[PDB]
Amino acid sequence: RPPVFWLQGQGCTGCSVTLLNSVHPSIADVLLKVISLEFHPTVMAWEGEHAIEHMRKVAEKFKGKFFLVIEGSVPVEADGKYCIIGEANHHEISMVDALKEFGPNAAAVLAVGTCAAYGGIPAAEGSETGATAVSKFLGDNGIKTPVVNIPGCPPHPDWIVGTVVLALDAIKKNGLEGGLAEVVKVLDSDGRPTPFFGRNIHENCPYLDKYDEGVMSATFTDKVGCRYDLGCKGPMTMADCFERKWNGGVNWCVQNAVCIGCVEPDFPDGKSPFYQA
Amino acid sequence: GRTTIAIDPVTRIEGHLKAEVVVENGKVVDARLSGGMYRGFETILRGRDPRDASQIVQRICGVCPTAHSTASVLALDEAFGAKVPNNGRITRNLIFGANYLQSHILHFYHLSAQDFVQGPDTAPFVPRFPKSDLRLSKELNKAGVDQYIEALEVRRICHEMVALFGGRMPHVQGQVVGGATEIPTKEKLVEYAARFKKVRDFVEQKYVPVVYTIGSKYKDMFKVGQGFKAALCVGAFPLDNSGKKHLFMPGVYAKGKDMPFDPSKIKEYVKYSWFAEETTGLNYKEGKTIPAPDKAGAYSFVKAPRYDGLSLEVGPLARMWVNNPELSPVGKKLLKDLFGISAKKFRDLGEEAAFSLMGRHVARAEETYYMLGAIEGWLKEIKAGEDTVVMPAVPASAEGTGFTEAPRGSLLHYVKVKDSKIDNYQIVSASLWNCNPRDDMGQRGAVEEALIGIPVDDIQNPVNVARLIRAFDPXLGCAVH
Numbered sequence A: 001r002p003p004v005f006w007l008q009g010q011g012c013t014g015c016s017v018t019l020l021n022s023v024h025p026s027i028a029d030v031l032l033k034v035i036s037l038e039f040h041p042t043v044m045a046w047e048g049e050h051a052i053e054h055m056r057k058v059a060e061k062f063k064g065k066f067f068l069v070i071e072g073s074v075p076v077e078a079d080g081k082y083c084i085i086g087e088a089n090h091h092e093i094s095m096v097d098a099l100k101e102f103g104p105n106a107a108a109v110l111a112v113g114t115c116a117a118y119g120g121i122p123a124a125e126g127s128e129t130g131a132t133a134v135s136k137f138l139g140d141n142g143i144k145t146p147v148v149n150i151p152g153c154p155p156h157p158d159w160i161v162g163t164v165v166l167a168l169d170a171i172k173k174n175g176l177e178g179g180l181a182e183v184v185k186v187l188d189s190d191g192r193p194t195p196f197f198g199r200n201i202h203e204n205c206p207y208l209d210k211y212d213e214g215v216m217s218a219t220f221t222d223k224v225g226c227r228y229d230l231g232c233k234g235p236m237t238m239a240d241c242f243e244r245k246w247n248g249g250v251n252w253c254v255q256n257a258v259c260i261g262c263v264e265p266d267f268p269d270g271k272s273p274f275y276q277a
Numbered sequence B: 001g002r003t004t005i006a007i008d009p010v011t012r013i014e015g016h017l018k019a020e021v022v023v024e025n026g027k028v029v030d031a032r033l034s035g036g037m038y039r040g041f042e043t044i045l046r047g048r049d050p051r052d053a054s055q056i057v058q059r060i061c062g063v064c065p066t067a068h069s070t071a072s073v074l075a076l077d078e079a080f081g082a083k084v085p086n087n088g089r090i091t092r093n094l095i096f097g098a099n100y101l102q103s104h105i106l107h108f109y110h111l112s113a114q115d116f117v118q119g120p121d122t123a124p125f126v127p128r129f130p131k132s133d134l135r136l137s138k139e140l141n142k143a144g145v146d147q148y149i150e151a152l153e154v155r156r157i158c159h160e161m162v163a164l165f166g167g168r169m170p171h172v173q174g175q176v177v178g179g180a181t182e183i184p185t186k187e188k189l190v191e192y193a194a195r196f197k198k199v200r201d202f203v204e205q206k207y208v209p210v211v212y213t214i215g216s217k218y219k220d221m222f223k224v225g226q227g228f229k230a231a232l233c234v235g236a237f238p239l240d241n242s243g244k245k246h247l248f249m250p251g252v253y254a255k256g257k258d259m260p261f262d263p264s265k266i267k268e269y270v271k272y273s274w275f276a277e278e279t280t281g282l283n284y285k286e287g288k289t290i291p292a293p294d295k296a297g298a299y300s301f302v303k304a305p306r307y308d309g310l311s312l313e314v315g316p317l318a319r320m321w322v323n324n325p326e327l328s329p330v331g332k333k334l335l336k337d338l339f340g341i342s343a344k345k346f347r348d349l350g351e352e353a354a355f356s357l358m359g360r361h362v363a364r365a366e367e368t369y370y371m372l373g374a375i376e377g378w379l380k381e382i383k384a385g386e387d388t389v390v391m392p393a394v395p396a397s398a399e400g401t402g403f404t405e406a407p408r409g410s411l412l413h414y415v416k417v418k419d420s421k422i423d424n425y426q427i428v429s430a431s432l433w434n435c436n437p438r439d440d441m442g443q444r445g446a447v448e449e450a451l452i453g454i455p456v457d458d459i460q461n462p463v464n465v466a467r468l469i470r471a472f473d474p475x476l477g478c479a480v481h
Ligand code: SF4
Pocket: A010, A011, A012, A013, A014, A015, A071, A072, A112, A113, A114, A115, A116, A120, A121, A152, A153, A154, A155, B059, B062, B170
């Protein structure tokens, strides 16, 4: 069970919650059989500088080998003061400083959720914190550690667990260096693993026949027509929700309402307004 | 003499919180809480199609997004002049109510329970303080761990319930201005009821009994954490179509007195908050959000909301105290058997015990039981096939306010529309009421005040500081937005 540190920057804890919803394997099996979650602010036993120091001791012991998950974006304005994640013996630690510290020493950084992968809502028009995506922040700071984007707002638990397991399997069959090279190979141009983000929603939508006939629902509760006029962003969105669906298969955005393009690099501004074409 | 203890991050809460306390003679004698992360949703929302708000605002918090969804669509309903159809009102209740179950269960077991229960000898359950004051027998501790594990599946099932008519969770697609986007079918209502029964069984047989039971091993925790003993509820879960009856009725409780809630008495101060000085003392309808992260003297990204000058708390304790419902049958029995207390309604716990560290955990479990009853009713009231939405046009100029109760406490959203776009949007959230810093006049926030008197007999293992904090179920993502 490889060590994982889970840092929250400008996140909403929704990427953590969506992980909790994993069906197969259960989050219990993930925590007890798949990874060792050594630091996570929402669920770990310890607290404060003690928790920070624990993460540091494990990071030193597993230098080059631990996985770093980032939930939320990284704000660079005001010397990093828009996100303070901890304090060690009177020294404040901003998200900017934590990423500069741990980022160089991770085996890989997993940018979970659209905020971490692409900037997301904290980076959107009208914001002023300098909310920055993980790969851009690391690159701006000369940190070359591989980054894997698992976007979505939130991602499906299967995208997160699936990418972790994919990477862990690749490392067990090729060693660390070969494993990562294998992971990089299955990423698209936006750093997303193709097993989950390689297909377009619209091309595989059960309502595509209605779209082609030009039969559009005029109210949300009309489930017969295509949802395009109501603002559906399926045509511009790369994810497998149409098949996997959500929360144990009980529903998904297009059946219930509309797709809002949550996995895309331009989310939200490029997918807005959500409720018109 | 005095020792200052700083805890950053405070863990097993949502979001970024630093607590600083001063301890003297084994007691907290002063406290400061710092919200250390800011995103600025109130400025980000400006200029957008107002219909977008009900999606954007949920990203304030992925633990309580249905709360912001609800507050937002209620504000939009008023601004757009939309009349939510009867069946849409009930559907919204079923979507939102299901997450109350998820959130209280998550809080007690996955955030709070480690305060009293020793987990298995593996991350993230270790390491922890060498002297964690964990008092349970082998048997009761094991019940806590087994239930923690079972509660992971139960909270997941709660989100399946939310998603049935909400689309997915976190971040529902199913609530919009004008109602709910998906009419409940007979088949899906069977699916919701089937999961609901499993959740009900866990709440009745495990959750409520374990809270009183653990509580009976920690009776000292009913004697501390009183704070101001002042409470706010703004109403939630409409039970009809005229905005009168709600599951939780509005009210303020302060200095032994009940009084009506008047939203015009809300002001937000910013002296000790990282916002421009000129923006202090604003009611939400004139609210302004100008960050000032270098301002001297300030120590939080949380504004300081005050109600007619009063520092109040919110959440299950506030709602259950204000509304004073009958206690659960299990609660009544265990209060008798374990505590020697005869109680019928929530206030029979007494003010001192109810407004306490453990009292807040009890209130949350009692409210979870209370919500079961409401959801049972909505399941009988809903009519399969009846329309749940209207499609209103976007107004050119309008304003609206949505009031509801998030699982953590009172929530309102205010929206002003000009040129068919968001001109201003102001959020006054639950943990804003709880986890705020001093106001301009030096009055502490609710949790700040509740920290005073908290025992710290061992400064090397100062466990009760964050124990107190966690009883409020803090959510700093919500507090700051
Ligand atoms: S990607 Fe979405 S769900 Fe995840 S932290 Fe960002 S706002 Fe929350």
